[PDB]
Amino acid sequence: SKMRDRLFFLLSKYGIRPRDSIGQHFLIIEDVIEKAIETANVNENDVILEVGPGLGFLTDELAKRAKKVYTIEIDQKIIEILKKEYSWNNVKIIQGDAVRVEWPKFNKVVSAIPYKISSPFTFKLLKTDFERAVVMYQLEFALRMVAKPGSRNYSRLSLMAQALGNVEIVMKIGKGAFYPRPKVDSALVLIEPRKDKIVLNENLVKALFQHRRKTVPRALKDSIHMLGVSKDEIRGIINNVPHSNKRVFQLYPEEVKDIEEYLKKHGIIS
Numbered sequence: 044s045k046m047r048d049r050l051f052f053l054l055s056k057y058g059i060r061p062r063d064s065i066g067q068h069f070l071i072i073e074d075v076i077e078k079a080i081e082t083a084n085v086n087e088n089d090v091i092l093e094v095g096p097g098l099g100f101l102t103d104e105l106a107k108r109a110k111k112v113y114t115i116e117i118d119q120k121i122i123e124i125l126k127k128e129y130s131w132n133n134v135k136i137i138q139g140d141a142v143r144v145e146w147p148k149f150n151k152v153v154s155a156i157p158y159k160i161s162s163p164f165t166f167k168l169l170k171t172d173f174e175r176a177v178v179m180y181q182l183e184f185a186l187r188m189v190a191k192p193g194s195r196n197y198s199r200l201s202l203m204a205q206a207l208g209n210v211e212i213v214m215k216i217g218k219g220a221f222y223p224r225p226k227v228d229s230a231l232v233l234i235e236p237r238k239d240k241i242v243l244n245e246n247l248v249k250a251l252f253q254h255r256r257k258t259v260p261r262a263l264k265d266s267i268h269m270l271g272v273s274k275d276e277i278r279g280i281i282n283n284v285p286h287s288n289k290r291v292f293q294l295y296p297e298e299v300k301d302i303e304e305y306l307k308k309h310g311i312i313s
């Protein structure tokens with residue numbers, strides 16, 4: 044393609060690495076970019092967050108259409124390339140770990156998300172105010188995000204995504220769309236916040252989903268015991284917990300929330 048060539052050319056121009064680390068794969072199909080941007084309805088008033096600008100192929104399309112783009116990049120060498128190779132008036136590049144740095148105020152996210160940060164980035168995204176996020180993930184991860192309570196891949200991510208978002212896989216994306224060619228497919232994922240969020244206590248969810256195949260009482264007995272509290276002191280309170288006849292992997296957010304309120308009331312949470 045025309046975009047694979049431009050990549051090869053910039054990599055060699057700056058003498059930099061095909062792969063800087065292992066989850067480094069650049070998107071090289073203009074039509075997958077155009078499809079993400081049109082799925083996000085990027086317009087002249089939107090303020091976009093992008094993570095992992097890479098060589099700026101997506102960033103360039105975003106800057107054409109949006110009013111402001113913030114793009115977070117860990118590697119200072121990539122940043123110096125983006126500054127030299129593009130002329131944008133409306134892009135603010137942020138040096139940092141996208142998981143660790145404080146985020147600017149934005150209404151939309153449009154980004155390929157490196158697989159290494161897919162889980163933490165998604166958890167952080169779901170806790171922020173935004174209209175719309177269109178993001179590319181590995182397919183397996185994307186399928187975890189839309190997994191249904193009681194399915195074999197339902198996990199803390201699945202729960203928090205259901206609790207806090209509407210999540211739609213827009214399309215599969217082939218391995219042929221990145222260089223280097225990955226060994227698994229990706230997916231274009233749309234996220235909108237729920238109008239009716241189910242805000243769950245993070246510590247509780249973590250406690251429960253540590254070992255998600257466990258029944259709900261066993262999960263809570265083991266995790267609070269390990270926090271450092273006696274078994275004898277909580278046995279009976281925890282035996283009467285709502286939804287006790289489920290394994291953690293089967294809980295709807297609504298059922299987690301009841302457990303939260305039951306435990307708040309019994310002094311286990313404040």
Ligand SMILES: NC(=[NH2+])NCCC[C@H](N)C(=O)O
Pocket residue numbers: 082209211213233235
């Ligand atoms: N394939 C898609 N574009 N799906 C769009 C879903 C729209 C979204 N649920 C909304 O309320 O705006």
Ligand SMILES: O=S([O-])[O-]
Pocket residue numbers: 065066067068158225226227
């Ligand atoms: O992360 S890539 O190497 O599949």
Ligand SMILES: O=S([O-])[O-]
Pocket residue numbers: 103129130131
């Ligand atoms: O339009 S971009 O290539 O600066």
Ligand SMILES: O=S([O-])[O-]
Pocket residue numbers: 215216217218219228
């Ligand atoms: O869509 S997968 O077959 O590359």
Ligand SMILES: O=S([O-])[O-]
Pocket residue numbers: 272273276
């Ligand atoms: O034994 S104490 O934690 O009530």
Ligand SMILES: O=S([O-])[O-]
Pocket residue numbers: 297298301
């Ligand atoms: O099912 S819970 O909301 O009582």
Ligand SMILES: [Zn+2]
Pocket residue numbers: 095096097116117118121
């Ligand atoms: Zn990077």
Ligand SMILES: [Zn+2]
Pocket residue numbers: 183
């Ligand atoms: Zn797996």
Ligand SMILES: [Zn+2]
Pocket residue numbers: 253254255
């Ligand atoms: Zn386990």
Ligand SMILES: [Zn+2]
Pocket residue numbers: 285286287289298
């Ligand atoms: Zn139940």
